[PDB]
Amino acid sequence: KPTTFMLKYDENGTITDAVDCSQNPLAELKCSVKSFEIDKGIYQTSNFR
Amino acid sequence: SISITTEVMPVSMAKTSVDCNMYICGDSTECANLLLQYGSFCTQLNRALS
Amino acid sequence: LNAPATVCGPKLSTDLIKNQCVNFNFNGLTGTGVLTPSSKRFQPFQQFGR
Ligand SMILES: *[C@@H]1O[C@H](CO)[C@@H](O)[C@H](O)[C@H]1NC(C)=O
């Protein structure tokens, strides 16, 4: 299906981690911040729903 | 004499936030694809407003 | 995209879908949104409003 993903490339040219922006609100937050590590607090997200 | 006088001072203003993707390309997939080419510009305004 | 369209194209029509984010096509005016009934009144022979 046509979906939105975010991928991480390491120091050897391979894919090591990925996330789907339409699955969970936490994953949507990760896709909005564009990082895998997020801190304590409240954020505002985009519409990948 | 005893005089009471008043002084008015502003303290805060309204807090606002803007959704960049729905302001620029409203419900358009093609415009969304063309907007990702302009990288890390919509994430620079949300930081300022926060 | 000014008046009622009198000469047109060979496309098949489709039944209406209500209250769902679907891609509409009204006389070549493509878009994406949800469809609701209306209580607005139009001028005669005027197609759409902005
Ligand atoms: C990947 O890159 C790192 C750092 O450049 C290097 O040390 C390593 O040998 C490379 N290959 C693998 C298989 O990790």
Atom of ligand 1 nearest to the CA of A11: 2
Q: How far apart are CA C34 and CA C19, in angstroms?
A: 5
β partners of residue C25? C30
- Tell me the H-state helices in chain A: 25-33
Let me know if A28 is exposed, middle or buried by CB neighbors in 10 A (0-12, 13-18, 19+): buried
Ligand 1 pocket, Cβ-based, cut-off 6 angstroms: A 11-12
DSSP state of A17: E
Asked if the Cβ–Cβ distance from A34 to B43 is below 8 Å, we say yes
Tokens representing B21? 């993707």
B19 CB neighbours in chain A (<8 A) are 46-47
Resolution in A: 3.0
Residue A26 · residue A36 · CB < 8 Å: no
Among chain A residues, the shortest Cα distance to B43 is held by: A33
Q: How far apart are CA A27 and CA B20, in angstroms?
A: 19
